[PDB]
Amino acid sequence: GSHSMRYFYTSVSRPGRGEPRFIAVGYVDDTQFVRFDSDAASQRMEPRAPWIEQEGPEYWDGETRKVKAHSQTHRVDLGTLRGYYNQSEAGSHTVQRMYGCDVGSDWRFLRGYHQYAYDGKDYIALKEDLRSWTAADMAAQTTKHKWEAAHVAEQLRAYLEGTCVEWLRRYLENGKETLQRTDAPKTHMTHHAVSDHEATLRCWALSFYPAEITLTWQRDGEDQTQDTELVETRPAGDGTFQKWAAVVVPSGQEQRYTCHVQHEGLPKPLTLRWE
């Protein structure tokens, strides 16, 4: 029932190569719906999901202007931070920004986020109360003082509790066939002789949405942690996700093992057995 909207921005400086590379993406839950790339020729925010293409020219002009502003402030920030930490001009550095909002099963506001990292390390972040900042070091403390003097957190809170959640609800309505759907996984088993006395059972979950899922093995009903192997959930490339879990078993004992599959799109968990 819960839902999320997130914007991710990354700026990487390119010393001796001109302007920093800037890439912005927007997600609703696990579905990307917008993208911007300073290297692309269009210089505009672009649709990545079908339900967002409905928006008219005012939407796209506004989002392009906003993402360009973010690009510009990030490019200023790269130099600002080089100064803060007294770093040379010859190396590459990375600024990342993320913000967004979470709503509950009733689509009411639940959480807000606004975070900055420098060189893969936390720099500054809006605290959970949406009223104050946490700073990772002294440079971030200068940023925090500047933002407190400008009352940034109040404007940010008004954005997160209004525009962010309101347009998330709009997207969830318009993209209902995509965002509000739960594709239960398509599961199957493969079997492979590893040696003349051992076998591998692999349990596949495919084409599920959203990405959260649980695969567990058990032997005669007892959870089987050891002799197993699971891969991280991975995108299929078409908006769905994949995962598998495998266990090595004595040949002739495959019937004792069961693969259990938990997913939101399943009314009850699935149980798969080889024989």
Binding site: G26, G62, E63, K66, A69, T80, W147, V152, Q155
Partner: peptide, 9 residues
């Protein structure tokens, strides 16, 4: 949609 901000670190 995004936040219309010119926020500098």
């Amino acid at each position: 949609k995004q936040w219309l901000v010119w926020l500098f670190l």
